[PDB]
Structure 1
Amino acid sequence: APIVLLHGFTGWGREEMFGFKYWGGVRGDIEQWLNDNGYRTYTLAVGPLSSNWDRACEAYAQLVGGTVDYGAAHAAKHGHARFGRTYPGLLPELKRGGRIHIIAHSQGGQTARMLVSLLENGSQEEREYAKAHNVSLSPLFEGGHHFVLSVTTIATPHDGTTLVNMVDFTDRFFDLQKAVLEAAAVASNVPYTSQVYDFKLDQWGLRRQPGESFDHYFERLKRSPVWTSTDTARYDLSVSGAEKLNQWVQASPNTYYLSFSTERTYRGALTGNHYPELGMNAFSAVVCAPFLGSYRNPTLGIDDRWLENDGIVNTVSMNGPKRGSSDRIVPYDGTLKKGVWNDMGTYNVDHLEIIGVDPNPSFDIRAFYLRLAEQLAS
């Protein structure tokens, strides 16, 4: 089965960002390493800020080909376009009984899980609405499709991240987007006339104008439904939103699930908080990690177990969905088990180091992805 790479709440296609890769960043090109070592690998690029639902509908069309269909019921409920972009299809073999391994980072792991759930079970709401209103139904919502062999998640907020609870989260989250642009040598205050980074917000009718800086565009997005509605990455990223997703997005017994967790902090002896390590990406170290390593909220069950983090996501959130979930999670024992989360361990690498967007010479990123690809091929 080929590997398909899937980004989180930042991420872009291989020709975007002047070729600086999300999967590899300053370290190289992970897809190229995998292909060069015999592991046939492709990359998806979906709306980074869009809901997991919208992203799963986009991923489906990107993989098999055709016009993105968000579901008549869903589009009506949230007030966005039902149909999106049209794709040629990266992998028409999936229409001929082929299967794929998905390797996903950050919120990509929520999207990958949801894509499996929709492939396997469809959506009863969409099936009923299509019957009631005499409209077409995407095959994604029928159920009985099985093309995902495995989902691997890396630093995924399966139970959310407490970052969303930060006082000025709206402004800091967009400053994070700017920090990632800067890592690619893309400035947030420059009036680019080429596309650079397409947020893929056709369903909401939003697009950056030529000559409009990312600073100015992001101020528009903050006030738009991709930030202010419940149909958003923002909603799904929160502890409450992730729990709601967990209530319906369950592990398929036909799919292998693997999780990798990340941590980049040390514990202070005096108040038990977690503090960022030397080498954490500067933005997380200064803006995000202090909060993540000290924020507790007893009424939500956010206790000391939540303080360890990788600069963006609480480490405890990453081994698999727990809150609101019935999925089982087991420590990897040398044999991958189907239908459950195989916890592949916790790595001392930060949220952006693990994809190479931030440097870390002590992390052999190439060996990490090659070892994972071997595990999936075996």
Structure 2
Amino acid sequence: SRANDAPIVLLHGFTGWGREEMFGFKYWGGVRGDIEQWLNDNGYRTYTLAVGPLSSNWDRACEAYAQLVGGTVDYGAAHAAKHGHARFGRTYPGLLPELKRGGRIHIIAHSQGGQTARMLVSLLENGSQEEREYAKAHNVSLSPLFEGGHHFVLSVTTIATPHDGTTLVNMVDFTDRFFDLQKFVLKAAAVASNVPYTSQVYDFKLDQWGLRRQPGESFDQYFERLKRSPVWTSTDTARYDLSVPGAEKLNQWVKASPNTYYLSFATERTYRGALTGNYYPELGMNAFSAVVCAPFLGSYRNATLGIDDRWLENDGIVNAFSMNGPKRGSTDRIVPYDGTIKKGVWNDMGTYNVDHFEVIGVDPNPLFDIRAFYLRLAEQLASLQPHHHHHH
């Protein structure tokens, strides 16, 4: 039964865009419809965040905070100075100014969005010691995000998240294939990549780096430029955080809050080869992943990196082993779901037979009842007790 009235906030991964972008084709629902609308129609207040798809989790978390409470994005003086980008970003009205008076939210995050959600909770609760020290030493102002003491996230649910990274980044042609993936998602929305649309269509939100698609430039041309830009070559990127080493680094500081419920959902769309031990793409897996990514994910081993046979099962984009919660470089605890959703730990909800993009509806799958999946989840989140009492 309903135990809380906290709104749900949706958060995309390394692909993703606002509700008005992509001519209205939703990241959350894709060819299946509009998940946010379904939830609202069923009585679960739901909102959508749109942050830089290729940006670092840190940048995205600062953007999410501002988008939630309102104001001008502040990446932190220390951070900005370390990485060489602007300290201030775009300005937002604030989706939920209610959070500045004591409200809470549930975040449902897909792909990288799960790393961002975790980091947002960590910064909200603990702030950043490095930013506080830098403000004290240099007399710069400090965003409240870095002070600590905010407890506005009741839960975080991750779906297909590379908590321990994805080996996809280890492909020798990853740079070219990753951008081909962005082209594939544009294709899902019936948008061409070789056309210089005057409309923005898909905004990468690279204000901090000073990058934007120019007049006369197609997505193909733009992506060529992004490949040689700091959002692709620096460590302050989705590229880095998505990697196994980068994810491990993030895990070393981004911990589970004792005050928050965590739910993890894994995805797989593969079968095992009996003679090779490799994993292969199932029929119905999105066409891009099936040809370009899945074969590699299902066969790449790297002993010194710790990539063993457990990593081969995948959803076309991320290794299933990486999805139940952070493990590499992490102190977080993961407990298999048994009917009781425990606080301050990852409740491993298991593995679902769907593809990285099918789970959000960007790729079709008539056998996956997407509406039921999200409604069931919404019901579960609404049942969470904001305060648990100890008992026998």
Offset, 1:335? 1.7
Stretches of structure 1 lacking an aligned partner (at least 5 in a row): none
Offset, 1:332? 1.0
Offset, 1:211? 2.6
Offset, 1:142? 0.1
Matched length: 378
Q: Distance in 2 between matches of 1:301 and 1:128?
A: 36
Contact 1:204 1:225 in 2 (8 A): yes
Which residue does 1:303 correspond to in 2?
308
SS, match of residue 369 in structure 1? helix
The runs of at least 4 consecutive aligned structure 1 residues that moved more than 4 Å come to: none
Aligned-residue RMSD, C-alpha = 0.4
Offset, 1:343? 0.6
Q: Distance in 1 between matches of 2:111 and 2:68?
A: 20
Which residue does 1:269 correspond to in 2?
274
- More displaced stretch, 327-336 vs 338-347: 327-336
SS, match of residue 248 in structure 1? coil
Per-residue deviation, residues 26-74 of structure 1 (Å, max 9, x unmatched): 0000000000000000000000000000000000000000000000000
- More displaced stretch, 53-62 vs 330-339: 330-339
SS, match of residue 135 in structure 2? helix
Contact 1:122 1:144 in 2 (8 A): yes
Stretches of structure 2 lacking an aligned partner (at least 5 in a row): 1-5, 384-392
Offset, 1:334? 1.4
Contact 1:149 1:254 in 2 (8 A): yes
SS, match of residue 80 in structure 2? helix
Offset, 1:361? 0.1
Q: Distance in 1 between matches of 2:310 and 2:158?
A: 20
SS, match of residue 37 in structure 2? helix
Offset, 1:333? 1.4
Offset, 1:103? 0.2
Offset, 1:246? 0.2
Q: Distance in 1 between matches of 2:88 and 2:312?
A: 41
Contact 1:264 1:309 in 2 (8 A): yes
Q: Distance in 1 between matches of 2:110 and 2:53?
A: 12
Per-residue deviation, residues 265-301 of structure 1 (Å, max 9, x unmatched): 0000111000000000000000000000000001011
Q: Distance in 2 between matches of 1:222 and 1:346?
A: 34
| TM-score normalised by structure 1 residue count | 1.00
Contact 1:159 1:318 in 2 (8 A): yes
Q: Distance in 2 between matches of 1:364 and 1:86?
A: 37
Q: Distance in 1 between matches of 2:293 and 2:108?
A: 25
Q: Distance in 1 between matches of 2:280 and 2:140?
A: 54
Per-residue deviation, residues 130-173 of structure 1 (Å, max 9, x unmatched): 00000100000000110000000000000000000001000000
Contact 1:256 1:338 in 2 (8 A): yes
Which residue does 2:365 correspond to in 1?
360
Q: Distance in 1 between matches of 2:172 and 2:78?
A: 34
Contact 1:34 1:41 in 2 (8 A): yes
SS, match of residue 145 in structure 1? coil
Q: 1:347 aligns with which of 332, 352, 367?
A: 352
Q: Distance in 2 between matches of 1:331 and 1:250?
A: 18
Contact 1:195 1:210 in 2 (8 A): no
Q: Distance in 2 between matches of 1:344 and 1:103?
A: 14
Per-residue deviation, residues 318-351 of structure 1 (Å, max 9, x unmatched): 0000000010001111121110000111000000
Q: Distance in 1 between matches of 2:82 and 2:333?
A: 32
Q: Distance in 2 between matches of 1:278 and 1:16?
A: 30
Contact 1:194 1:210 in 2 (8 A): no
Per-residue deviation, residues 178-233 of structure 1 (Å, max 9, x unmatched): 00100000110011000000000000000001331000000000000000000000
Give % identity: 96
Q: Distance in 2 between matches of 1:44 and 1:211?
A: 29
Which residue does 2:374 correspond to in 1?
369
Per-residue deviation, residues 223-255 of structure 1 (Å, max 9, x unmatched): 000000000000000000000000000000000
Which residue does 2:126 correspond to in 1?
121
Offset, 1:359? 0.1
Which residue does 1:200 correspond to in 2?
205
Q: Distance in 2 between matches of 1:209 and 1:347?
A: 41
Which residue does 2:45 correspond to in 1?
40
Q: Distance in 2 between matches of 1:105 and 1:145?
A: 23
Q: Distance in 1 between matches of 2:268 and 2:347?
A: 18
Q: Distance in 2 between matches of 1:301 and 1:66?
A: 42
Which residue does 2:153 correspond to in 1?
148
Q: Distance in 2 between matches of 1:33 and 1:86?
A: 28
Q: Distance in 2 between matches of 1:191 and 1:140?
A: 38
